[PDB]
Amino acid sequence: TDKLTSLRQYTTVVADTGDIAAMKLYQPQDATTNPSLILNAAQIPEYRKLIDDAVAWAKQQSNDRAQQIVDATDKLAVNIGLEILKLVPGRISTEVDARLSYDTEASIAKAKRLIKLYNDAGISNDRILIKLASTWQGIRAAEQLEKEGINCNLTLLFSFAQARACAEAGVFLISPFVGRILDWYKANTDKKEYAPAEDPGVVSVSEIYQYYKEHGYETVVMGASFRNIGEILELAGCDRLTIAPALLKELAESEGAIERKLSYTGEVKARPARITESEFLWQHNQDPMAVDKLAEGIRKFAIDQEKLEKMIGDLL
């Protein structure tokens, strides 16, 4: 068979895009979006109806332009999620405003608002994953949300400290980026070419995977952000993997069966004491890569949120 079909034996395939065409082509279990993908999705001509629906609904909720821009941008994200849910049997990941990444209370509020919008469309909490950046504040937000029945996808995870803190908060899922870790090592280091096994992102996810299974953590590990299929194949065995359409296409067109790389065959060991904020900040900041990338990811997603608000504002 082809690589994609072979991968499904060990790993749950998730599509990373806001485009419904890829859902029809690759039949993933779940789908994920982020502010950059939602902004890109808004440029697709077929999605014009969704934008008009967002704007029309916003104007019916209030006569205040400020609230209208926020209501329409949230609704558009939810609308794109609604279309995807019609084609996937699993969950959809929708991300909260990145500008709230360092605000626990604002993140809880925004997450509940997106959930309310989905609930308004008849969709229940078991089909949604609220996406939050893995800062200490987002993690503390997620821990509280999980207790309230809202499942979260802790994204932009780069350091081991983030992985440990997320697991201890009892979050549903974490999204360790693989490709962005490679980007950093390509830019800030001597070595520009890495073999799949020596790829920093792969090594990072593998280490996180083993740590989670070793201590019996129920938190799902979903590798995200890929630059090539080599990284995907080397992670065959990971709980789930969110892959972009271009690489999903490469897997489907490449023949040959693949072997499982990620496994933990031993017994569950005792969990250590919970990491504190001070220890988290110390450990996270020891990692130069994670320092740059966590901050940078939040910035880019914020710019894309503003760019969406700009677009929506011109239509009111």
Place this chain on the structure above:
Amino acid sequence: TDKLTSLRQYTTVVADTGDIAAMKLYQPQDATTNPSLILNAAQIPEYRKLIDDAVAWAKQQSNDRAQQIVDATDKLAVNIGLEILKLVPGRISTEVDARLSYDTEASIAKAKRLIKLYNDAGISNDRILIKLASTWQGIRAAEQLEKEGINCNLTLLFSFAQARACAEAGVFLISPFVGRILDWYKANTDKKEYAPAEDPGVVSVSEIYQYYKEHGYETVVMGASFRNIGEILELAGCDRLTIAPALLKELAESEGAIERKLSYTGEVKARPARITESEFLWQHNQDPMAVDKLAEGIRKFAIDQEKLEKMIGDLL
């Protein structure tokens, strides 16, 4: 019997021309064209209908003159291929614009366009071979095309590095030139007269043939470009051989049976590691003949593409 009939026992005979008269005379399994042959074919008075069909079809697809010239030149190549397919049971080779030889993405696009035109005429992919120059970029284009169901004919092959890279990409067929290799040695060397066995082109193809069969490569080896029948006879046994009408005539008029020269009777050996771009460029450039000829072939085919576009432009 005659040499041509005797040759068919060991080698699949392919006609190298765009002229349908030769298909009727020699009954080849396949046929091949290239930009120089397509330009020559366009001068044949019987082919005027095909040109008028190309121009008329182009004008119906768009009102933009730039697109019309491109649509008509592609259609003419496809039209000549359509006439040939009515007389041959096998495949037809149609070559992509040589000006795209160092552009992988443009080559994939152009190949898919020619395939689309053939499909528009009801012809399926199994009857077509898309011809691409054997540069690293064309090889990478071909590897991707094969995965998508488009079979390719890697032409203008001169060096062993090209042969190795083509085999590893899993391409359907390769066309090592024999006569152009001889031309180079006649121009850039002391020896002007070569016996069939010491002919550089023959020795080149023989070496490539053995390498392919020795490692179990499914890639078909088709010798092309001949200067005399001695080269053809010395290659009796090669998978296929694309011969020009003049030499095809010489074989049919010469009596006597011939013996098979090219064979591999041993077992299939293990394939080495895949050659990288750096190693390819190094090995290819070590061969002075291949350096000159690959570059020169692409230039000549480019000039002929422009000459065709000139002709077509004067008819719009």
